[PDB]
CSV table of N, CA and C in Angstrom, one decimal:
chain,number,residue,atom,x,y,z
A,1364,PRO,N,18.9,90.5,-4.2
A,1364,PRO,CA,19.2,89.8,-3.2
A,1364,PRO,C,18.4,89.9,-2.0
A,1365,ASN,N,18.0,88.9,-1.4
A,1365,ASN,CA,17.1,88.8,-0.2
A,1365,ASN,C,15.7,89.7,-0.2
A,1366,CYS,N,15.5,90.3,-1.4
A,1366,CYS,CA,14.4,91.0,-1.6
A,1366,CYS,C,13.7,90.5,-3.0
A,1367,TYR,N,12.8,89.5,-2.8
A,1367,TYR,CA,12.4,88.8,-3.9
A,1367,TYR,C,11.0,89.0,-4.2
A,1368,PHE,N,10.7,89.2,-5.5
A,1368,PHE,CA,9.3,89.3,-5.9
A,1368,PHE,C,8.4,88.3,-5.6
A,1369,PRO,N,7.1,88.4,-5.0
A,1369,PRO,CA,6.4,87.3,-4.6
A,1369,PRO,C,5.9,86.3,-5.7
A,1370,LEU,N,5.8,86.9,-6.9
A,1370,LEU,CA,5.2,86.1,-8.0
A,1370,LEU,C,6.1,86.1,-9.2
A,1371,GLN,N,6.3,84.9,-9.8
A,1371,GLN,CA,7.1,84.6,-10.9
A,1371,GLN,C,6.3,84.1,-12.1
A,1372,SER,N,7.0,84.2,-13.2
A,1372,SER,CA,6.3,84.0,-14.6
A,1372,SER,C,5.8,82.5,-14.6
A,1373,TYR,N,4.8,82.3,-15.2
A,1373,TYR,CA,4.3,80.9,-15.6
A,1373,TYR,C,4.6,80.5,-17.1
A,1374,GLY,N,5.7,81.1,-17.6
A,1374,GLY,CA,6.0,81.1,-19.0
A,1374,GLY,C,5.7,79.9,-19.9
A,1375,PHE,N,4.9,80.0,-20.9
A,1375,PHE,CA,4.5,78.8,-21.7
A,1375,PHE,C,5.0,78.9,-23.2
A,1376,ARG,N,5.3,77.9,-23.7
A,1376,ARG,CA,5.8,77.6,-25.1
A,1376,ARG,C,5.2,76.5,-25.7
A,1377,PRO,N,5.0,76.4,-27.0
A,1377,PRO,CA,4.3,75.1,-27.6
A,1377,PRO,C,5.1,73.9,-27.5
A,1378,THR,N,6.3,73.9,-27.0
A,1378,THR,CA,7.3,72.7,-26.9
A,1378,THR,C,7.8,72.6,-25.5
A,1379,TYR,N,7.1,72.0,-24.6
A,1379,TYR,CA,7.5,71.5,-23.3
A,1379,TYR,C,7.2,70.1,-23.2
A,1380,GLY,N,7.5,69.5,-22.0
A,1380,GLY,CA,7.1,68.2,-21.7
A,1380,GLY,C,5.5,68.3,-21.2
A,1381,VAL,N,4.9,67.0,-21.1
A,1381,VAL,CA,3.5,67.0,-20.7
A,1381,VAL,C,3.3,67.7,-19.3
A,1382,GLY,N,4.2,67.3,-18.3
A,1382,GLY,CA,4.2,67.9,-17.0
A,1382,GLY,C,4.3,69.3,-16.9
A,1383,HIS,N,4.9,69.9,-18.1
A,1383,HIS,CA,5.1,71.3,-18.2
A,1383,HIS,C,4.2,71.9,-19.2
A,1384,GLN,N,3.3,71.2,-19.8
A,1384,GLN,CA,2.3,71.8,-20.8
A,1384,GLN,C,1.3,72.7,-20.0
A,1385,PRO,N,0.7,73.7,-20.7
A,1385,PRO,CA,-0.4,74.5,-20.2
A,1385,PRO,C,-1.7,73.9,-20.0
A,1386,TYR,N,-1.8,73.2,-18.9
A,1386,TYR,CA,-3.1,72.6,-18.6
A,1386,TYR,C,-4.2,73.8,-18.2
A,1387,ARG,N,-5.2,73.7,-18.8
A,1387,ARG,CA,-6.4,74.6,-18.4
A,1387,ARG,C,-7.3,73.9,-17.3
A,1388,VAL,N,-7.4,74.5,-16.2
A,1388,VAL,CA,-8.1,73.9,-15.1
A,1388,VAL,C,-9.3,74.8,-14.8
A,1389,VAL,N,-10.4,74.3,-14.7
A,1389,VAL,CA,-11.5,75.1,-14.0
A,1389,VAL,C,-12.1,74.1,-13.0
A,1390,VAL,N,-12.5,74.6,-11.9
A,1390,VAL,CA,-13.0,73.8,-10.7
A,1390,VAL,C,-14.5,74.3,-10.4
A,1391,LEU,N,-15.4,73.4,-10.5
A,1391,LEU,CA,-16.8,73.6,-10.1
A,1391,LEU,C,-17.0,73.3,-8.6
A,1392,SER,N,-17.4,74.3,-7.8
A,1392,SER,CA,-17.6,74.1,-6.4
A,1392,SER,C,-19.0,74.0,-5.9
A,1393,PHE,N,-19.7,72.9,-6.0
A,1393,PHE,CA,-21.0,72.8,-5.6
A,1393,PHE,C,-21.3,73.1,-4.2
A,1394,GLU,N,-22.4,73.3,-3.7
A,1394,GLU,CA,-22.7,73.6,-2.2
A,1394,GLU,C,-23.5,72.4,-1.7
A,1395,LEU,N,-24.4,71.9,-2.5
A,1395,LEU,CA,-25.2,70.8,-1.9
A,1395,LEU,C,-25.7,71.0,-0.6
A,1396,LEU,N,-26.1,72.3,-0.3
A,1396,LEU,CA,-26.8,72.6,1.1
A,1396,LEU,C,-28.2,72.1,0.8
A,1397,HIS,N,-29.2,73.0,1.2
A,1397,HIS,CA,-30.6,72.7,1.1
A,1397,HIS,C,-31.4,74.0,0.8
A,1398,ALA,N,-30.7,75.1,0.8
A,1398,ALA,CA,-31.4,76.5,0.6
A,1398,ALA,C,-32.0,76.4,-0.8
A,1399,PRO,N,-33.1,77.1,-1.0
A,1399,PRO,CA,-33.8,77.1,-2.3
A,1399,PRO,C,-32.8,76.8,-3.4
A,1400,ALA,N,-33.0,75.9,-4.2
A,1400,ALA,CA,-32.0,75.6,-5.2
A,1400,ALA,C,-32.2,76.4,-6.5
A,1401,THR,N,-31.2,76.6,-7.3
A,1401,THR,CA,-31.2,77.5,-8.5
A,1401,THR,C,-30.6,76.7,-9.6
A,1402,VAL,N,-29.3,76.1,-9.6
A,1402,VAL,CA,-28.8,75.3,-10.6
A,1402,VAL,C,-29.2,73.9,-10.4
A,1403,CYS,N,-30.3,73.5,-11.0
A,1403,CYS,CA,-30.8,72.1,-11.1
A,1403,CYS,C,-30.4,71.4,-12.5
A,1404,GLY,N,-30.0,70.3,-12.4
A,1404,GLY,CA,-29.6,69.7,-13.7
A,1404,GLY,C,-30.9,69.3,-14.5
A,1405,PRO,N,-30.9,68.7,-15.7
A,1405,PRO,CA,-32.1,68.5,-16.5
A,1405,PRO,C,-33.2,67.5,-15.8
A,1406,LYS,N,-33.2,66.3,-16.3
A,1406,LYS,CA,-34.1,65.3,-15.6
A,1406,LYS,C,-35.7,65.3,-16.0
A,1407,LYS,N,-36.3,66.4,-16.6
A,1407,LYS,CA,-37.5,66.4,-17.1
A,1407,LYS,C,-38.6,66.2,-15.9
A,1408,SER,N,-39.6,67.1,-15.9
A,1408,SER,CA,-40.6,67.1,-14.8
A,1408,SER,C,-41.7,66.2,-15.2
A,1409,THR,N,-41.9,65.1,-14.4
A,1409,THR,CA,-43.2,64.3,-14.6
A,1409,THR,C,-44.4,64.9,-13.8
A,1410,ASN,N,-45.5,64.6,-13.9
A,1410,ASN,CA,-46.6,65.2,-13.3
A,1410,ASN,C,-46.8,64.7,-11.8
A,1411,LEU,N,-47.8,65.1,-11.1
A,1411,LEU,CA,-47.9,64.6,-9.7
A,1411,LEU,C,-48.8,63.5,-9.6
B,163,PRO,N,-15.0,67.3,-38.2
B,163,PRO,CA,-15.5,68.1,-37.1
B,163,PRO,C,-16.7,67.4,-36.5
B,164,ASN,N,-16.8,67.4,-35.2
B,164,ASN,CA,-17.7,66.8,-34.4
B,164,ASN,C,-18.1,65.3,-34.7
B,165,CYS,N,-17.2,64.7,-35.5
B,165,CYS,CA,-17.4,63.3,-35.9
B,165,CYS,C,-16.0,62.7,-35.7
B,166,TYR,N,-15.7,62.2,-34.5
B,166,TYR,CA,-14.3,62.0,-34.1
B,166,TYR,C,-14.1,60.5,-33.9
B,167,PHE,N,-12.9,60.0,-34.4
B,167,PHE,CA,-12.5,58.7,-34.2
B,167,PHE,C,-12.4,58.4,-32.8
B,168,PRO,N,-12.9,57.2,-32.3
B,168,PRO,CA,-12.9,56.8,-30.8
B,168,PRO,C,-11.4,56.7,-30.4
B,169,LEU,N,-10.6,56.2,-31.2
B,169,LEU,CA,-9.2,55.7,-30.8
B,169,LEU,C,-8.1,56.4,-31.6
B,170,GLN,N,-7.2,57.0,-30.9
B,170,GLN,CA,-6.0,57.8,-31.4
B,170,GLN,C,-4.8,57.0,-31.1
B,171,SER,N,-3.7,57.5,-31.9
B,171,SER,CA,-2.5,56.7,-31.8
B,171,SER,C,-1.7,56.9,-30.5
B,172,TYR,N,-1.1,55.8,-30.2
B,172,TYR,CA,-0.1,55.8,-29.0
B,172,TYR,C,1.3,56.1,-29.4
B,173,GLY,N,1.5,56.8,-30.3
B,173,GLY,CA,2.9,56.9,-31.1
B,173,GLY,C,4.0,57.0,-30.2
B,174,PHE,N,5.1,56.1,-30.6
B,174,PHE,CA,6.3,56.0,-29.6
B,174,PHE,C,7.6,56.2,-30.5
B,175,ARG,N,8.5,56.9,-29.8
B,175,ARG,CA,9.8,57.3,-30.5
B,175,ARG,C,10.8,57.0,-29.3
B,176,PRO,N,12.1,56.6,-29.7
B,176,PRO,CA,13.0,56.4,-28.6
B,176,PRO,C,13.5,57.7,-27.9
B,177,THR,N,12.9,58.9,-28.2
B,177,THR,CA,13.3,60.1,-27.5
B,177,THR,C,12.1,60.8,-27.1
B,178,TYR,N,11.6,60.4,-26.0
B,178,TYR,CA,10.6,61.2,-25.1
B,178,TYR,C,10.9,61.3,-23.8
B,179,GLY,N,10.2,62.0,-22.9
B,179,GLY,CA,10.4,62.0,-21.6
B,179,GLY,C,9.9,60.8,-20.8
B,180,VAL,N,10.3,60.6,-19.6
B,180,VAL,CA,10.1,59.3,-18.8
B,180,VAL,C,8.6,59.2,-18.7
B,181,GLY,N,7.7,60.2,-18.5
B,181,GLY,CA,6.3,60.1,-18.4
B,181,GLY,C,5.7,59.8,-19.8
B,182,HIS,N,6.4,60.0,-20.8
B,182,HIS,CA,6.1,59.6,-22.2
B,182,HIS,C,6.8,58.4,-22.8
B,183,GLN,N,7.5,57.7,-22.0
B,183,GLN,CA,8.2,56.5,-22.4
B,183,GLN,C,7.3,55.3,-22.6
B,184,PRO,N,7.6,54.4,-23.5
B,184,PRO,CA,6.8,53.2,-23.6
B,184,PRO,C,6.9,52.2,-22.6
B,185,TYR,N,6.1,52.4,-21.4
B,185,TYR,CA,6.1,51.4,-20.3
B,185,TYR,C,5.4,50.3,-20.8
B,186,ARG,N,6.0,49.0,-20.6
B,186,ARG,CA,5.4,47.8,-20.8
B,186,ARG,C,4.6,47.3,-19.5
B,187,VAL,N,3.4,47.1,-19.5
B,187,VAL,CA,2.7,46.8,-18.3
B,187,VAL,C,2.0,45.5,-18.6
B,188,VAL,N,2.2,44.6,-17.6
B,188,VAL,CA,1.4,43.4,-17.6
B,188,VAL,C,0.7,43.3,-16.2
B,189,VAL,N,-0.5,42.9,-16.1
B,189,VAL,CA,-1.2,42.8,-14.8
B,189,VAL,C,-1.4,41.3,-14.6
B,190,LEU,N,-1.5,40.9,-13.3
B,190,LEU,CA,-1.6,39.5,-12.8
B,190,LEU,C,-2.8,39.5,-11.9
B,191,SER,N,-3.9,38.9,-12.4
B,191,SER,CA,-5.1,39.0,-11.5
B,191,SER,C,-5.5,37.7,-10.9
B,192,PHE,N,-5.0,37.5,-9.7
B,192,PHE,CA,-5.2,36.2,-8.9
B,192,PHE,C,-6.6,36.2,-8.5
B,193,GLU,N,-7.1,35.1,-8.1
B,193,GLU,CA,-8.5,34.9,-7.7
B,193,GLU,C,-8.5,34.6,-6.2
B,194,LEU,N,-7.6,33.8,-5.7
B,194,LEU,CA,-7.5,33.5,-4.3
B,194,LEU,C,-8.9,33.1,-3.8
B,195,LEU,N,-9.6,32.4,-4.7
B,195,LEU,CA,-10.9,31.8,-4.1
B,195,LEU,C,-10.6,30.7,-3.2
B,196,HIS,N,-11.3,29.4,-3.4
B,196,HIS,CA,-10.9,28.3,-2.8
B,196,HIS,C,-11.2,27.0,-3.7
B,197,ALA,N,-11.7,27.2,-4.9
B,197,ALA,CA,-11.9,26.2,-5.9
B,197,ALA,C,-10.7,25.4,-6.0
B,198,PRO,N,-10.7,24.2,-6.5
B,198,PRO,CA,-9.6,23.4,-6.6
B,198,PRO,C,-8.5,24.2,-7.3
B,199,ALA,N,-7.3,24.3,-6.6
B,199,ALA,CA,-6.2,25.2,-7.1
B,199,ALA,C,-5.5,24.6,-8.2
B,200,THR,N,-4.8,25.3,-9.1
B,200,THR,CA,-4.0,24.8,-10.2
B,200,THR,C,-2.6,25.5,-10.3
B,201,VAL,N,-2.6,27.0,-10.3
B,201,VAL,CA,-1.3,27.6,-10.2
B,201,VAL,C,-0.8,27.6,-8.7
B,202,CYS,N,-0.1,26.7,-8.3
B,202,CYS,CA,0.5,26.8,-6.9
B,202,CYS,C,2.0,27.2,-7.0
B,203,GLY,N,2.4,28.1,-6.2
B,203,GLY,CA,3.8,28.4,-6.1
B,203,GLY,C,4.8,27.2,-5.8
B,204,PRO,N,6.0,27.4,-5.7
B,204,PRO,CA,6.9,26.2,-5.4
B,204,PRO,C,6.6,25.7,-4.1
B,205,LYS,N,7.6,25.9,-2.9
B,205,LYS,CA,7.5,25.5,-1.6
B,205,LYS,C,7.9,24.1,-1.3
B,206,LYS,N,7.9,23.1,-2.2
B,206,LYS,CA,8.5,21.8,-1.9
B,206,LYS,C,7.6,21.0,-0.9
B,207,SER,N,7.1,19.8,-1.2
B,207,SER,CA,6.2,19.1,-0.5
B,207,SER,C,6.9,18.2,0.6
B,208,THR,N,6.6,18.5,1.8
B,208,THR,CA,7.2,17.6,2.9
B,208,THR,C,6.3,16.4,3.0
B,209,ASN,N,6.7,15.4,3.9
B,209,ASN,CA,5.8,14.2,4.0
B,209,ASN,C,4.7,14.5,4.9
B,210,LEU,N,4.0,13.4,5.3
B,210,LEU,CA,2.7,13.7,6.3
B,210,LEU,C,3.3,13.2,7.7
C-alpha cells in the first residue's frame, strides 16, 4: 500500500486482442544535419 | 518462402473484438466543381 513498484510487467501471451498483441517497434532517428556524412543510401556514383 | 501471395484473407467471424469487427464502409466522393449539376439535394424550388 502506497509503496508501489515503478515498473510493472508487460506480460505477453499468444492469445490477446490486436491492441494487446506484442508489437515489435524499432525507431530510426536520422540527424539530417550536414556534418561529414557516414550512412548514405545507395544511388550509384556517376562520374564528374 | 520469399514467394508470397499479394492478397490475404479478411476472415470474419461473429466473435471478434470491436477493432476486428466487420465494419461496412462506403465513401461518397463529391466533386463540388461547377459543371452542370445532376445530384442536387432536396430544398424545394420557390418561384422567381
